[PDB]
Design a protein around this ligand. Structure first.
Ligand code: HEC
Ligand code: HEC
Ligand code: HEC
Ligand code: HEC
Ligand code: HEC
Ligand code: HEC
Length: 159
């Protein structure tokens, strides 16, 4: 009712709850209204934007409330990681990214990717660009993880 849902394409929504913030600021709506949240035609701020001080990040910095830049504090807002993301493109079977595989493999880290503009800042990145270190390529280069230059079947289906 007073809980606002922030829907995400590949994960459960993050739910902003007024109750706990009101008990915190003593119903002073002025703290967050028409200053922090214009709530008129907002974009979908990214976590990096929040790290810059936008959205929830205007407070969740570590000083006032837990920071949005803490791998151990993501659970404070997000329930989990996400559901398996399926990538579609012409020329190969669906490429699938799973967290069940990766997170437990990176000691539970999250910002390694989510706060890495070279790993998340793209849209329909190609294998060429992955080779130059973009997206999956930032780690699948035979140093960190198996190279993206080959191993097609390890990521793509029907291969
Ligand atoms: C052998 C070297 C491979 C072939 C042939 C292809 N891949 Fe990949 N791949 C993966 C993902 C998650 C994506 C999508 C990323 C995004 O869209 O942002 C891709 C994309 C492609 C594409 C489309 C772009 C292009 O034409 O270059 C094709 C046709 C494609 N891939 C063919 C993931 C991975 C990966 C996991 C680390 C590996 C090893 C490969 N891809 C290997 C090949
Ligand atoms: C790189 C190896 C990653 C690590 C480590 C973590 N995540 Fe992840 N996550 C990654 C990808 C490839 C994707 C899809 C990217 C996209 O275009 O959306 C995701 C997705 C999520 C999401 C969904 C975001 C959305 O739907 O808008 C969330 C909420 C998310 N990831 C959270 C998350 C957490 C909490 C992690 C630590 C336990 C974590 N991810 C690690 C890549 C990577
Ligand atoms: C910061 C901690 C907040 C305080 C204090 C209050 N509100 Fe708020 N409100 C806040 C956010 C992050 C949002 C989500 C806006 C968005 O961009 O999606 C909201 C939303 C509302 C709404 C709209 C509800 C909806 O349509 O989902 C209303 C009607 C609203 N807020 C009222 C309200 C009142 C009256 C407050 C004091 C009693 C108040 N808010 C405080 C953030 C915060
Ligand atoms: C509550 C203060 C949050 C904490 C702490 C974390 N996230 Fe978050 N995340 C939150 C919201 C409200 C939203 C949507 C904001 C909007 O305007 O739409 C999100 C969104 C993300 C996304 C998608 C966008 C992006 O940056 O890629 C992801 C992938 C996500 N959040 C991941 C994430 C991680 C890994 C966190 C820990 C470092 C993290 N979030 C903490 C609110 C909050
Ligand atoms: C400052 C003006 C705030 C803004 C903007 C947002 N939050 Fe916040 N949050 C703030 C404080 C000072 C606290 C209180 C202390 C506590 O630990 O409870 C919080 C707390 C939360 C919590 C924790 C709730 C709990 O059960 O303890 C969550 C999950 C949270 N905040 C989420 C959240 C989101 C998603 C916001 C942006 C959409 C957001 N907060 C903004 C102060 C402020
Ligand atoms: C570094 C943070 C990574 C990024 C970015 C992505 N992956 Fe990854 N991947 C990484 C590691 C550490 C490992 C371990 C490899 C090993 O065997 O030592 C992996 C593993 C995978 C796998 C193998 C899964 C399994 O067989 O259980 C796949 C299929 C895979 N990774 C796919 C993948 C895709 C599609 C990515 C981009 C969206 C991606 N990974 C990013 C580290 C990292």
């Amino acid at each position: 009712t007073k809980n606002v849902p922030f829907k995400l394409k590949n994960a459960a929504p993050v739910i902003f709850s007024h109750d706990i913030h009101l008990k915190k600021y003593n119903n002073n709506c002025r703290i967050c209204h028409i200053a922090l949240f214009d709530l008129r035609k907002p974009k979908r701020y990214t976590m990096l934007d929040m790290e810059k001080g936008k959205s929830c990040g205007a407070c969740h910095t570590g000083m006032k409330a837990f920071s949005v830049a803490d791998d151990s504090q993501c659970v404070r807002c997000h329930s989990g990681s996400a559901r398996p993301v399926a990538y579609r493109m012409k020329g190969a079977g669906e490429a699938v990214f799973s967290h069940e595989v990766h997170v437990p493999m990176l000691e539970g880290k999250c910002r390694t990717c989510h706060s890495n503009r070279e790993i998340t800042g793209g849209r329909n990145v190609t294998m060429a660009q992955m080779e130059k270190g973009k997206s999956c390529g930032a780690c699948h280069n035979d140093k960190m993880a198996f190279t993206v230059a080959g191993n097609c079947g390890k990521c793509h289906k029907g291969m």
